[PDB]
UniProtKB/Swiss-Prot annotation, chain A:
Component of the Mediator complex, a coactivator involved in the regulated transcription of nearly all RNA polymerase II-dependent genes. Mediator functions as a bridge to convey information from gene-specific regulatory proteins to the basal RNA polymerase II transcription machinery. The Mediator complex, having a compact conformation in its free form, is recruited to promoters by direct interactions with regulatory proteins and serves for the assembly of a functional preinitiation complex with RNA polymerase II and the general transcription factors. This is Mediator of RNA polymerase II transcription subunit 7. PANTHER family: MEDIATOR OF RNA POLYMERASE II TRANSCRIPTION SUBUNIT 7. One of its GO terms (biological process) is positive regulation of transcription by RNA polymerase II. Coiled coil: none annotated. The gene is MED7. Keywords: Activator, Nucleus, Transcription, Transcription regulation. It holds the Pfam family Med7.
Swiss-Prot record, chain B:
Component of the Mediator complex, which is composed of at least 21 subunits that form three structurally distinct submodules. The Mediator head module contains MED6, MED8, MED11, SRB4/MED17, SRB5/MED18, ROX3/MED19, SRB2/MED20 and SRB6/MED22, the middle module contains MED1, MED4, NUT1/MED5, MED7, CSE2/MED9, NUT2/MED10, SRB7/MED21 and SOH1/MED31, and the tail module contains MED2, PGD1/MED3, RGR1/MED14, GAL11/MED15 and SIN4/MED16. The head and the middle modules interact directly with RNA polymerase II, whereas the elongated tail module interacts with gene-specific regulatory proteins. One of its GO terms (cellular component) is nucleus. Present with 1391 molecules/cell in log phase SD medium. Keywords: Activator, Coiled coil, Nucleus, Transcription, Transcription regulation. It comes from the Eukaryota. The chain holds residues 71 to 138 of 140 of the full protein. The keyword Coiled coil applies. It comes from Saccharomyces cerevisiae (strain ATCC 204508 / S288c). Residues 15-55 form a coiled coil. GO terms for biological process: negative regulation of transcription by RNA polymerase II; positive regulation of transcription by RNA polymerase II; positive regulation of transcription elongation by RNA polymerase II; positive regulation of transcription initiation by RNA polymerase II; regulation of transcription by RNA polymerase II; RNA polymerase II preinitiation complex assembly. Belongs to the Mediator complex subunit 21 family. It is found in: Nucleus.
UniProtKB/Swiss-Prot annotation, chain C:
Belongs to the Mediator complex subunit 31 family. This is Mediator of RNA polymerase II transcription subunit 31. GO terms for cellular component: core mediator complex; mediator complex; nucleus. Component of the Mediator complex, a coactivator involved in the regulated transcription of nearly all RNA polymerase II-dependent genes. Mediator functions as a bridge to convey information from gene-specific regulatory proteins to the basal RNA polymerase II transcription machinery. The Mediator complex, having a compact conformation in its free form, is recruited to promoters by direct interactions with regulatory proteins and serves for the assembly of a functional preinitiation complex with RNA polymerase II and the general transcription factors. GO terms for biological process: DNA recombination; DNA repair; meiotic gene conversion; positive regulation of transcription elongation by RNA polymerase II; positive regulation of transcription initiation by RNA polymerase II; regulation of transcription by RNA polymerase II; RNA polymerase II preinitiation complex assembly; transcription by RNA polymerase II. The keyword Transcription applies. Keywords: Activator, Nucleus, Transcription, Transcription regulation. One of its GO terms (molecular function) is transcription coactivator activity. It comes from the Eukaryota. It is found in: Nucleus.
From Swiss-Prot, chain D:
Component of the Mediator complex, a coactivator involved in the regulated transcription of nearly all RNA polymerase II-dependent genes. Mediator functions as a bridge to convey information from gene-specific regulatory proteins to the basal RNA polymerase II transcription machinery. The Mediator complex, having a compact conformation in its free form, is recruited to promoters by direct interactions with regulatory proteins and serves for the assembly of a functional preinitiation complex with RNA polymerase II and the general transcription factors. Present with 1617 molecules/cell in log phase SD medium. Component of the Mediator complex, which is composed of at least 21 subunits that form three structurally distinct submodules. The Mediator head module contains MED6, MED8, MED11, SRB4/MED17, SRB5/MED18, ROX3/MED19, SRB2/MED20 and SRB6/MED22, the middle module contains MED1, MED4, NUT1/MED5, MED7, CSE2/MED9, NUT2/MED10, SRB7/MED21 and SOH1/MED31, and the tail module contains MED2, PGD1/MED3, RGR1/MED14, GAL11/MED15 and SIN4/MED16. The head and the middle modules interact directly with RNA polymerase II, whereas the elongated tail module interacts with gene-specific regulatory proteins. It is found in: Nucleus. Transmembrane segments: none annotated. The gene is MED4.
Amino acid sequence: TSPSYVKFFTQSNLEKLPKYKEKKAATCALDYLIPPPMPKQYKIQELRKLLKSLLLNYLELIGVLPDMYERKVENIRTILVNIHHLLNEYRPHQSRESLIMLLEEQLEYKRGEIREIEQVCKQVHDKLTSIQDTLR
Amino acid sequence: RQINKLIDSLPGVDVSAEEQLRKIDMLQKKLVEVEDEKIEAIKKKEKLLRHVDSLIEDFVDGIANSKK
Amino acid sequence: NPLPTRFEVELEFIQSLANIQYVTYLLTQQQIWKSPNFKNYLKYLEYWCNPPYSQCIVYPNCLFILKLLNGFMESXXXXXXXXXXXXXXXXXXXXXXXX
Amino acid sequence: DKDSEELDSKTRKILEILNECHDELXXXXXXXXXXXXXXXXNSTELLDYATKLSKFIWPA
Amino acid sequence: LVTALEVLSLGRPNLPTHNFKLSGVSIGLILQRLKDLNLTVSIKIALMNIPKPLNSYHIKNGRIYFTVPNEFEIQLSTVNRQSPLF
């Protein structure tokens, strides 16, 4: 259903709201009308390493099979998790980079429009001059 | 090998962020400036078009006063 | 979890407007439209579209759908019937873009 | 007479090119540039708030 | 980031700008277009052999209004406007 606060939104309370704002600026339904407050190089050098280790574990997992394999698969799990950590470090950085790209594109577009109209105007002027050079 | 080519093909990342933020701000400034330049160019082109218009009404007045 | 807060209650209620069938259930009523209370509440819930209240909105649709309904309550069954077909056309594309 | 006709044709073509150049180009773009400047001035809220919009299924 | 700028600008304008019925529920520049139509007609009319009783005319905003007197409480005046010229 709908929240209970809706029962405090009558036209009379809306008529009493401005003076309650001016009075409170200097507990009730009019407080229900007031909105609530707001609550209170890099990793690329390691990724390679991790990658190189992953294969090295896979070989082990191949070379075991016996009941020893279990122990090995544990280590493998840890490696994969590490990979995920570094990618987490790539989540916000790439976002900012994307913003950069967008802005640059905007700049280029801006100049392109003007350039188009410019060349058109030039052509027009030349054409008229030609006609002039044929009469006198 | 595809993973190696991809991690070597990623853009140049940095350990700090002041570089990226600085780039963003600069790009904003360039956006404003190039917008203004666009405005000026549009104005000039408008003026020229007004002139060659003027020429055309001259011609029209000519032929109008002519043939009839 | 402990007792809720009016901020989270109004937040979850305005975020519930992103669902199409829920808005359909809210509009296909007969009691909440006899008195000018639910309309004034929906028009009151427009503070989430402005910062810093917009920093907690997870679904961008619920806000704009709210602005549509607040845009429609100013000026019965038929139009209420009219909106969901169109929104239905819109949904799946965004769903494809999400995941 | 023939010469005069030729000149008239030339003038007509010039006029047409003019009308095209007028239809190519003005204050609406300036207003959209002003509103765009009002929209650029913040990115810090979008770089930290837009990251939570990628993980989200519609509410049920 | 597009949707972030959209919620910054209150709403999500791609939804109404892409939806049809939702868009169904959600001056000086035009004046100059009429004057450009008389410049095209005035040169072709200017070249042709206009008859003698039609040499007098008044180019009105987007038309050519020419008169010749008669009776019936009015004056034999007409408004002309076209488009082709080739």
